Design a protein around this motif. Structure first.
Motif, PDB file in Angstrom:
ATOM      1  N   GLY A 125       0.834  -1.215   0.000  1.00  0.00           N
ATOM      2  CA  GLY A 125       0.000   0.000   0.000  1.00  0.00           C
ATOM      3  C   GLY A 125       0.859   1.250   0.000  1.00  0.00           C
ATOM      4  O   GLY A 125       0.485   2.216   0.658  1.00  0.00           O
ATOM      5  N   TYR A 126       1.980   1.267  -0.718  1.00  0.00           N
ATOM      6  CA  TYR A 126       2.921   2.400  -0.687  1.00  0.00           C
ATOM      7  C   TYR A 126       2.703   3.260  -1.927  1.00  0.00           C
ATOM      8  O   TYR A 126       2.964   2.796  -3.002  1.00  0.00           O
ATOM      9  CB  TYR A 126       4.374   1.948  -0.594  1.00  0.00           C
ATOM     10  CG  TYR A 126       5.272   3.018  -0.073  1.00  0.00           C
ATOM     11  CD1 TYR A 126       5.191   3.405   1.251  1.00  0.00           C
ATOM     12  CD2 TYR A 126       6.171   3.672  -0.894  1.00  0.00           C
ATOM     13  CE1 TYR A 126       6.010   4.388   1.749  1.00  0.00           C
ATOM     14  CE2 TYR A 126       7.026   4.632  -0.397  1.00  0.00           C
ATOM     15  CZ  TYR A 126       6.938   4.999   0.934  1.00  0.00           C
ATOM     16  OH  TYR A 126       7.750   5.946   1.477  1.00  0.00           O
TER      17      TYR A 126
ATOM     18  N   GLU B 111      -3.346   8.002   9.202  1.00  0.00           N
ATOM     19  CA  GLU B 111      -1.863   7.932   9.220  1.00  0.00           C
ATOM     20  C   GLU B 111      -1.348   9.005   8.253  1.00  0.00           C
ATOM     21  O   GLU B 111      -1.974   9.187   7.188  1.00  0.00           O
ATOM     22  CB  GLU B 111      -1.464   6.489   8.867  1.00  0.00           C
ATOM     23  CG  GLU B 111       0.006   6.220   8.551  1.00  0.00           C
ATOM     24  CD  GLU B 111       0.256   4.828   7.934  1.00  0.00           C
ATOM     25  OE1 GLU B 111      -0.605   4.396   7.151  1.00  0.00           O
ATOM     26  OE2 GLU B 111       1.336   4.170   8.207  1.00  0.00           O
TER      27      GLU B 111
ATOM     28  N   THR C 181      -1.775   9.987   0.804  1.00  0.00           N
ATOM     29  CA  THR C 181      -1.386   8.593   0.558  1.00  0.00           C
ATOM     30  C   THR C 181      -2.559   7.874  -0.120  1.00  0.00           C
ATOM     31  O   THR C 181      -3.709   8.387  -0.115  1.00  0.00           O
ATOM     32  CB  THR C 181      -0.944   7.852   1.829  1.00  0.00           C
ATOM     33  OG1 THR C 181      -2.098   7.653   2.651  1.00  0.00           O
ATOM     34  CG2 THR C 181       0.167   8.563   2.582  1.00  0.00           C
ATOM     35  N   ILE C 182      -2.280   6.671  -0.587  1.00  0.00           N
ATOM     36  CA  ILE C 182      -3.302   5.770  -1.161  1.00  0.00           C
ATOM     37  C   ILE C 182      -3.920   4.966  -0.027  1.00  0.00           C
ATOM     38  O   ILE C 182      -4.711   4.171  -0.348  1.00  0.00           O
ATOM     39  CB  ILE C 182      -2.705   4.846  -2.242  1.00  0.00           C
ATOM     40  CG1 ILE C 182      -1.508   4.045  -1.720  1.00  0.00           C
ATOM     41  CG2 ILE C 182      -2.354   5.652  -3.461  1.00  0.00           C
ATOM     42  CD1 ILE C 182      -1.157   2.844  -2.534  1.00  0.00           C
ATOM     43  N   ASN C 183      -3.641   5.225   1.261  1.00  0.00           N
ATOM     44  CA  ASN C 183      -4.132   4.310   2.317  1.00  0.00           C
ATOM     45  C   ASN C 183      -5.553   4.718   2.760  1.00  0.00           C
ATOM     46  O   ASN C 183      -5.683   5.684   3.538  1.00  0.00           O
ATOM     47  CB  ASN C 183      -3.098   4.221   3.430  1.00  0.00           C
ATOM     48  CG  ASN C 183      -1.754   3.802   2.878  1.00  0.00           C
ATOM     49  OD1 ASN C 183      -1.562   2.640   2.486  1.00  0.00           O
ATOM     50  ND2 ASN C 183      -0.831   4.748   2.805  1.00  0.00           N
ATOM     51  N   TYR C 184      -6.572   3.973   2.300  1.00  0.00           N
ATOM     52  CA  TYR C 184      -8.008   4.226   2.651  1.00  0.00           C
ATOM     53  C   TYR C 184      -8.670   2.992   3.288  1.00  0.00           C
ATOM     54  O   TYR C 184      -9.929   2.840   3.172  1.00  0.00           O
ATOM     55  CB  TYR C 184      -8.713   4.753   1.396  1.00  0.00           C
ATOM     56  CG  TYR C 184      -8.364   6.185   1.113  1.00  0.00           C
ATOM     57  CD1 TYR C 184      -7.150   6.498   0.527  1.00  0.00           C
ATOM     58  CD2 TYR C 184      -9.169   7.251   1.512  1.00  0.00           C
ATOM     59  CE1 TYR C 184      -6.769   7.802   0.277  1.00  0.00           C
ATOM     60  CE2 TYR C 184      -8.806   8.565   1.237  1.00  0.00           C
ATOM     61  CZ  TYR C 184      -7.582   8.853   0.654  1.00  0.00           C
ATOM     62  OH  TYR C 184      -7.149  10.131   0.359  1.00  0.00           O
ATOM     63  N   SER C 185      -7.875   2.153   3.958  1.00  0.00           N
ATOM     64  CA  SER C 185      -8.330   0.896   4.583  1.00  0.00           C
ATOM     65  C   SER C 185      -9.549   1.177   5.441  1.00  0.00           C
ATOM     66  O   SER C 185     -10.545   0.469   5.303  1.00  0.00           O
ATOM     67  CB  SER C 185      -7.305   0.273   5.478  1.00  0.00           C
ATOM     68  OG  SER C 185      -6.401  -0.499   4.762  1.00  0.00           O
TER      69      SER C 185
END
Ligand SMILES: Cc1ncc(COP(=O)(O)O)c(/C=N/OCCC(=O)O)c1O
Ligand SMILES: Cc1ncc(COP(=O)(O)O)c(/C=N/OCCC(=O)O)c1O
Ligand SMILES: [Mg+2]
Ligand SMILES: [Mg+2]
Lengths: 279, 279
Positions: A31-32, A136, A142-146
């Motif tokens: 997820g980077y 975070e 970022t692409i982090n949408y968990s």
């Protein structure tokens, strides 16, 4: 008008059917990555320099070097609008950690430019839930949408269509995809200043609000201040200004758009029209 | 022995050169996915049922349905070892949120099985830094490693080769890729019980430690307890048991592997040998 036929990968126009990444890419395994998203109208990406500046800042925070300078990226974007023969579109930039030798260490980032139809998106504001959570690296796109995506079932099950994150249940932040504002009964506009993404829509609304002579406080917001507010609204690229009618068991007014929210909605449309006049 | 020629995507064996995902995949756009990673020796994935159980649990936490039951996934894994004609390998499972219509809402997950050579990985324990951070959804093996990867430059610049996350700088958790243990001067083994990934190596070491008659405390660890500990070590699939010689400015003993860490390293090798005898 025209169907989307092409994306761009690493500076090459590719048919959408062939827009792929090898599975060694760090977005897939770790997820980077960072991204940005903006609309185009009248053949022009809106506020483009502001979005591209954020994209470059986001990349620097993950130590990912974009393989093109900003003027060359702008060219690629404009070239892709022309290739797809569209004037009206959504545009997504993605910069991944790239094809990693060891499934962890970035070596070379992958750059994607994707293109979509404009979002298709009565009186009533949307209904949302509070959710205790802190994004975070929140200043970084970022692409982090968990958490935001994992929460879709919970949002729906509970009878809402979105959420507002509250850091430790105390400090109002943003939704997974929108910045969040209150309007107090004295017409003071309030929005978080820390540990949120600095939305382009947020920036344009704050400027328009201040240019109209409204008081805007960018400050920590206690969860208990929802009960002092007259209005609440979201801002984002795809929503513009969107009235919130209910948070948890609290209806804002009769749940229809508040006075100041309506004003700011018109002023945002005005910022868009002003921007297009400069293109 | 044999070069890795094949991965598996969605139950199809594909040459590694053609192992791609379309860029609409939610791991690429939204970092939405889970994974697992295990070694194979003597033609057998180690502790496979424990890894697959974790994989299924991870998937359920993101509401992602694995398109095969556990016995069918096990078959695909074994079939891939045979296709690659290897007995010694690393194996990565990835389950992404799939090709999403709107770049956010999962519709159908993508399942990847990737395969690698065994990790290639003097007296001295590794040197690590503390870093204040708490992993999101830490019991779930998500693909989200932003902070761990973003920290690689900082780890290196500071003269270390890894880190140990400390929740709010107070509560010792885990590294980005390893569980973390202390051994106290009375030989009590201490490891975090909450807000960490439940490592398979961790599980095997704890069991081996308890079967050897050691005291093992799974409990909150205050950062100040680093100074009461005699030994520190990491556990992970690729490290097994790895001695830590220094944390920040503190050398553990003379920085060489402690007594109990060495014992547990041998016992872990024993758990692996015992597992292989059951295959
Ligand atoms: C975490 C977060 N906060 C705030 C916003 C609002 O930022 P602007 O859009 O106003 O710059 C976004 C927008 N994402 O929108 C990305 C496109 C999408 O969600 O489809 C966001 O992801
Ligand atoms: C956050 C986290 N904690 C603990 C561990 C240790 O878990 P086990 O390996 O013992 O089950 C891992 C391992 N990842 O290893 C994934 C493979 C890799 O990092 O290349 C991890 O990612
Ligand atoms: Mg009204
Ligand atoms: Mg020694």
């Amino acid at each position: 008008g025209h169907m989307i036929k092409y994306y761009n990968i690493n500076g090459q126009q590719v048919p959408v059917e062939n827009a792929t990444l090898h599975v060694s890419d760090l977005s897939i395994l770790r997820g980077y990555g960072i991204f940005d998203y903006f609309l185009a109208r009248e053949g022009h990406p809106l506020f483009l320099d502001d979005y591209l500046n954020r994209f470059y800042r986001s990349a620097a925070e993950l130590y990912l070097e974009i393989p093109f300078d900003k003027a060359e990226l702008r060219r690629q974007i404009y070239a892709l609008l022309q290739a797809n023969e569209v004037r009206e579109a959504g545009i997504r930039l993605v910069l991944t950690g790239g094809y990693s030798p060891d499934g962890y260490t970035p070596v070379n980032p992958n750059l994607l430019i994707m293109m979509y139809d404009l979002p298709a998106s009565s009186a009533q504001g949307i209904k949302i839930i509070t959710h205790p959570f802190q994004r975070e690296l929140p200043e970084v796109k970022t692409i982090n949408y968990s958490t935001g995506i994992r929460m879709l079932k919970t949002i729906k099950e509970r009878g809402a269509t979105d959420l507002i994150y509250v850091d430790q249940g105390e400090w109002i932040r943003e939704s997974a995809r929108s910045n969040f504002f209150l309007v107090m009964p004295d017409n003071t506009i309030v929005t978080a200043d820390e540990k949120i993404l600095w939305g382009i829509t947020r920036r344009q609304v704050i400027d328009a609000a201040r240019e109209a002579g409204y008081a805007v406080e960018e400050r920590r917001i206690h969860i208990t201040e929802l009960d002092q507010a007259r209005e609440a609204f979201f801002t984002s690229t795809i929503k513009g200004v969107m009235a919130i009618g209910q948070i948890d068991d609290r209806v804002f007014g009769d749940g229809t758009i508040g006075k100041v929210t309506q004003e700011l909605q018109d002023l945002f449309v005005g910022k868009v029209k002003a921007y297009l006049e400069t293109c």
